[PDB]
Amino acid sequence: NGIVPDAGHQGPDVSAVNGGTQVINIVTPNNEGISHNQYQDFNVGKPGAVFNNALEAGQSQLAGHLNANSNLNGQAASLILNEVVSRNPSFLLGQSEVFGIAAEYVLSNPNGITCDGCGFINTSRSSLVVGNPLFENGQLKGYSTLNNTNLLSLGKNGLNTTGLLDLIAPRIDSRGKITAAEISAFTGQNTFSQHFDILSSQKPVSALDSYFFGSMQSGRIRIINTAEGSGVKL
Amino acid sequence: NGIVPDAGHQGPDVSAVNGGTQVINIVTPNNEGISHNQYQDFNVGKPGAVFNNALEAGQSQLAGHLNANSNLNGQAASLILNEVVSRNPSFLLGQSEVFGIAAEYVLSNPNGITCDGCGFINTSRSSLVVGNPLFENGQLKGYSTLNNTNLLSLGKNGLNTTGLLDLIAPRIDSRGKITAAEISAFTGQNTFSQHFDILSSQKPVSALDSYFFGSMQSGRIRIINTAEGSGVKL
């Protein structure tokens, strides 16, 4: 059971189909179209995980036939925000599929995220954020990696998606092949808008060095490091 | 004598001061402010090279006191375009200084460019183009790396500038520390605007792989590879 929802209102319904693939019936989107899901644990194993963003029944790639997600109330998410609220880091070793209506996908975990052979299916954009979402008056205002020195790690088996990819962390350590339509990596201690515009930056008390080994199979790569002094090694 | 001007109208006056530092009195800018300099050979050694873009006499960093460049006729270049028109590749092993009015700097050499401990002083933007400039009706229209498989190489001693940096080539092989305000690397077989907007791209007949080893000390890095299939290894 890699994914364990929070007990409260923003905990989605989580189950599994024969073979171990996890199925997540994401919570009702708010009026902005954001499904804000909170978790005590968020990990994807080799059998993968399916996030049900469907308004009609149909065939998922990883978990077979599923009904429409009743939680949606006829209103598919524009953004599936997965927020780890505990101190547990995340490990992604398999595919995350959005079943139904294609959406943006975010995993935020300020304790650390590791991706080793992970991928994202039917996402327009997927973002991995070692940091927290920022909310004002119940609305998403952006993200923060301030005062955080934890790591976004990408292992030897890499990361694949047909969509856009954002990698957001105090520091990144990547050792595998990253395949994506576009890759954006933002490092350092920053605050961000909803769309990962950098709004502010702070100088870390100690060096925050990032390391990119391996190939990046993408037509467009951007790397922004705001940690004045700290570098990007390739 | 690393730098040898073309014999014609666009060949600048090239000399040297005691110690071997080369001094280039760039040609009269056109009405767009472009000083279009043509060369049989263009190489910068450890003593460096000073491009005289000065309207008044003064002190250069690398070559001591110089007069204003008489060729300017009171009209400093906005862009110093250095074009190698022969089949000779370029090696840059030292600093290129713009003396006088800060300008944009371009070196175009479709035969190949190698930079090992090179740098750029008093440039707002410096671009290394393994490719040719494109001219229509006497005006600069952009650049081309089409039908070219040659290499932009950066060696163990790296490249330093306080300004923006563009690296434009069919393929790039970098093994050292690149320090710049911003780094833009565009690889593949492309046509470009004057400002390195990609206007067209072609699929190369064979793979054009680029390799980035070493650190990139810059707050903003962009890598665009249009060679569908070919990758970027870090």
Curated annotation (Swiss-Prot), chains A, B:
Superkingdom to which the source organism belongs: Bacteria
Compartments reported by the entry: Cell outer membrane
More details: The conserved amphipathic domains in ShlA and HpmA may be responsible for pore formation.
Function: Bacterial hemolysins are exotoxins that attack blood cell membranes and cause cell rupture by mechanisms not clearly defined. Cell-bound hemolysin, which releases heme-iron from erythrocytes by interaction with the erythrocyte membrane. HpmA requires HpmB function.
Name recorded for this polypeptide: Hemolysin
Organism: Proteus mirabilis
Lineage: Bacteria, Pseudomonadati, Pseudomonadota, Gammaproteobacteria, Enterobacterales
